[PDB]
Design a protein around this ligand. Structure first.
Ligand SMILES: *Cc1cc2c(cc1C)nc1c(=O)[nH]c(=O)nc-1n2C[C@H](O)[C@H](O)[C@H](O)COP(=O)(O)OP(=O)(O)OC[C@H]1O[C@@H](n2cnc3c(N)ncnc32)[C@H](O)[C@@H]1O
Ligand SMILES: Cc1cc2nc3c(=O)[nH]c(=O)nc-3n(C[C@H](O)[C@H](O)[C@H](O)COP(=O)(O)OP(=O)(O)OC[C@H]3O[C@@H](n4cnc5c(N)ncnc54)[C@H](O)[C@@H]3O)c2cc1C
Lengths: 535, 536
């Protein structure tokens, strides 16, 4: 038996849990939110809280249609490229993927509107944020879908903190109970196999059992920080990610005897990371969404550019895991970001995972030297320090010569404004996350400027990480966790990164994690409200 | 509820894992049944060459070829976990589990092979020339010698699997192992203490049968290549299928979903290029493309440019096909086009090892043909159109013809000097080793290349990425015992072969690197299962 009882028990206090809790409470249920950490907010707290809301009221107010068939074609084209077909009944998606994407379109705006109306998540529009693949002809609403917390800073970097504040303030105002230091570790079933509550491990190592009359809703985030799970499931061998450190995939263990379908386990939301911060478990670390610097290139261990440094983070991270079967190594396992004094002075940022950081910031990851040859010596020392993580990678014997050639070639591209090798700056999204730069009259392309012929020169190692994972128990479009016959496990719900995303390995646009997540919190809460009170 | 039959040991699947597990079990004196889902025995194993890679095997020792254990471990460690391999680390940078599993392979494969041969179940011959796939690594101290093959396999060895299933199943029958075909196991039955006490299987006629196991249920049920949902949701690359038996649909993943197991290595398969049209068309006789045929032959992408060494090890080459172009939201190499001339048609064709170049009389529906290169590109275009819904509506670039001419001029230079400046074709031993048949040419500096003909006819085939089978599933210890989430055996429950987690990660060490380890674990599993008390 149990020491407490509520209509709805919510696990986790990021976006998925707080919104699920609020929607549940507003239907009149009693609700508790159980949080494993000492503080609320999880990864959501660290985010910019961009949220991508199709057919939102700001768009409609501007007379911008977001036609539903074209919304589905955009997400289908990006999510399942090989199979996308406009003439196919579900656009080449499976029925489940199609229905999930449809649910996002149907429910995101009503969810966003209700949260705002109740003062839980007031927003402003981000009209100029373009979708990450807006150039595709399938995208018929290329900008307009993004919302952000109303009181977020101009950079929006603190959006997640603002959102956790407004969400949790409304939750307290409306009588939702909170318990921190409660690590849920078990779902309790009745004799009919229905979820009737949880067991949680407390700080002092005692367990408590808490009954849920109607539903247990998991919003417990991903598994980035269980290295075993991460390594065994993800399609790339990432070194970590900006996910909260308490996101260790507990739901995967919780459901291991429940007969669930683990889906999309092979995918994470990907991003490059400041490699030394991932290895060193810096909890304040962000994914490198904006690769800082215009007088800045990435080179491999041969001293050559291999990629557009301004490419969308979810795609750029994948470059780091290209495999060289002939040499039995990952040639790009870490890349080296190299920049000059101009970028140091005018492109530094504490936000969006920039490796270029302003005076006073933690600079332990920054490598520095007065010559290019000196820099390579310093980079070598850094590679040696982390040898056991990166295959004992070394700079090639012709590194310095190749680097000089790479800088000369790039400097040409920066003069003409045309990167003939990797097309840096030619897609809108490259400009979108370009970061701060020193204004230069008659810079031809804002993403490039010639690297100075004098030092000092700076560098940082860039490795591959996650925002968090996006695989877990499969749900229906109402957030109900399914058994292997696709039938709900009665009373059991999941929302957010702890369950399977329908987005496969794709990242549609800024806010493509939180926008869908709010839609499903709303659908989950609406369904959970309809549950009979049991046991 | 009750059971309609009872045995000491119940074995699920009749490929290598199941037959060997069953035989070892029976020879300890247990009663044994083998439950096979299909109408026929043998699974993927039946289709294989039955190369099996057996470290420190008796033929090697008899020939005076050393295979020191510490160096064996460094070879497999270096290949398996490249980022973390470290000769100074106590487990070489592997996890304790991976290290222990690799050690078990070295310790147990040879005694397993010896016993199966002694009993006449798997007589073998040595294949002294079969060389490891990364033989150039200094860690490999026994670069050749580890491979065995069924004694009566053909000279090419291509029917080895059929011979092995014949000798194994004949011995099994001889020694009183029971067989039930058309029995699709779908559930493990537990007692009140949560121990495995038997199975439920679905029969062809849709009746269900419950069969008690006194000591152990051993799964040898193969991988999940042919469950598209599981394949698509777990593997690190979006493969189109594979040469796995079509009945390999990952049943064990569903069976164990309520048993609290740890699914491990789910992100990896044994990978290989495939003749794309045979994967899409579900040709059950299809083999992975283990040798890419032809010396006067190149692979081009849809731009008409070479992108890869066509002679690269199959498990590595397959990965090239899934390179991702984030800027264009496409897989640039999703299919590559193998193009060859009459010389390669005549002298490199093969019915074996997944060759796209096939001799007269072989099924050649996948072969595209034209008298001119310009005609060939028109023919290739029609083929891409036919499969548009599978390959992102990929098209040849508008400058395909001109690029191809340039690619062939470049390659023809490389073929005459013997030096492929772009992709180093022929510079690693395995490129030469798996090069396939070629017309002997006195003037040839590099056996893997010869100039492409200045006249037609020309031939082409689409190449896509596939599997041999998957290699993730419930984690076992080195004794084949399926573990719960606290790393403790689920009593009575065993798994061997592709249905459980391989310790090889995404790596393919050598020819026979699936079957060799597999026999080691069948032996260890059977030895442990024999030790189980009789229960329920
Ligand atoms: C495709 C292929 C693979 C291959 C090869 C050549 C080809 C064309 N050559 C190889 C080689 O020479 N050496 C080597 O090491 N590997 C080679 N491979 C890979 C290899 O064939 C496989 O790794 C290996 O044979 C797998 O053996 P295993 O015993 O694990 O699996 P199987 O042979 O596929 O048999 C599984 C059987 O189980 C039955 N099954 C499936 N589900 C059920 C249920 N529910 N109940 C009962 N039986 C079930 C399948 O029907 C199958 O028969
Ligand atoms: C720096 C950064 C910036 C980002 N910016 C954006 C952005 O602007 N827009 C966007 O769409 N996405 C963004 N993302 C991704 C986004 O933050 C996440 O996808 C989203 O916040 C996940 O929310 P969630 O509720 O699923 O999980 P989380 O916010 O991670 O919350 C899960 C919570 O569950 C708790 N928990 C875990 N296990 C248990 C247990 N056993 N019992 C109890 N509680 C448990 C955790 O401690 C945690 O508090 C960003 C990510 C990062 C790292």
């Amino acid at each position: 038996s149990f020491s407490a009882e509520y209509d709805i028990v919510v696990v986790g206090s990021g976006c998925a849990g707080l919104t699920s809790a609020l929607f549940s409470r507003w239907h009149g249920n009693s609700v508790v939110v159980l949080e494993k950490a000492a503080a609320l907010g999880g990864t959501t707290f660290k985010s910019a809280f961009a949220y991508w809301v199709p057919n939102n009221v700001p768009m409609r107010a501007a007379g911008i249609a977001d036609p539903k068939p074209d919304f589905l074609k955009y997400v289908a084209r990006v999510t399942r490229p090989q199979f996308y077909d406009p003439e196919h009944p579900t656009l080449g998606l499976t029925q489940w993927e199609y229905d999930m994407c449809e649910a996002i379109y149907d429910s995101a705006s009503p969810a966003a509107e209700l949260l705002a109306q109740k003062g839980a998540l007031p927003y402003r529009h981000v009209p100029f944020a373009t979708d990450y693949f807006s150039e595709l002809p399938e995208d018929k609403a290329k900008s307009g879908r993004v919302l952000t917390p109303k009181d977020g800073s101009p950079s929006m970097a603190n959006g997640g903190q603002v959102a956790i504040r407004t969400l949790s303030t409304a939750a307290r105002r409306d009588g939702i109970a909170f318990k921190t230091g409660h690590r849920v570790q078990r779902v309790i079933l009745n004799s009919k196999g229905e979820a009737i509550g949880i067991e949680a491990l407390k700080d002092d190592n005692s367990v408590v059992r808490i009954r849920a009359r109607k539903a247990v809703i998991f919003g417990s985030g991903g598994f980035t920080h269980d290295p075993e799970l991460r390594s065994n499931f993800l399609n790339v061998p990432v070194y970590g990610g900006c996910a909260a450190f308490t996101n260790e995939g507990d739901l995967v263990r919780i459901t291991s005897s429940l007969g669930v379908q683990l889906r999309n386990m092979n995918h994470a939301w990907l991003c490059p990371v400041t490699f030394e911060k991932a290895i060193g478990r810096d909890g304040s670390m962000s994914g490198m969404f904006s690769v800082a610097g215009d007088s800045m290139i990435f080179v491999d261990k041969r001293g050559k550019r291999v990629v557009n440094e301004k490419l969308n983070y979810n795609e750029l991270c994948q470059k780091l895991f290209e495999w060289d079967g002939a040499k039995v190594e990952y040639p790009n396992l870490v890349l080296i970001s190299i920049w000059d004094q101009r970028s140091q002075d005018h492109s530094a940022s504490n936000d969006y995972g920039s490796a270029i950081v302003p005076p006073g910031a933690d600079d332990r990851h920054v490598i520095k030297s007065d010559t290019l040859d000196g820099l390579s010596q310093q980079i070598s020392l850094r590679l040696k320090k982390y040898a056991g993580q990166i295959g004992h990678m070394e700079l090639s014997s012709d590194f310095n010569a190749n680097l000089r050639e790479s800088i000369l070639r790039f400097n040409g591209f920066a003069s003409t404004g045309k990167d003939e090798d990797f097309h840096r700056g030619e897609r809108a999204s490259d400009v979108l996350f370009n970061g701060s730069t020193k204004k230069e009259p008659d810079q031809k392309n804002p993403t490039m400027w010639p690297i100075s012929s004098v030092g000092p020169y700076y560098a940082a190692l860039v490795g591959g990480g996650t925002l968090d994972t996006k695989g877990g128990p499969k749900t229906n479009t109402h957030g109900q966790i399914l058994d292997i016959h696709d039938k709900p496990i009665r009373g059991l719900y999941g929302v957010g990164n702890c369950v399977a995303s329908a987005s496969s390995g794709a990242y549609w646009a800024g806010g493509a994690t939180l926008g869908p997540m709010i839609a499903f919190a709303y659908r989950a809460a609406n369904a959970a409200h309809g549950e009979p009170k049991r046991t």
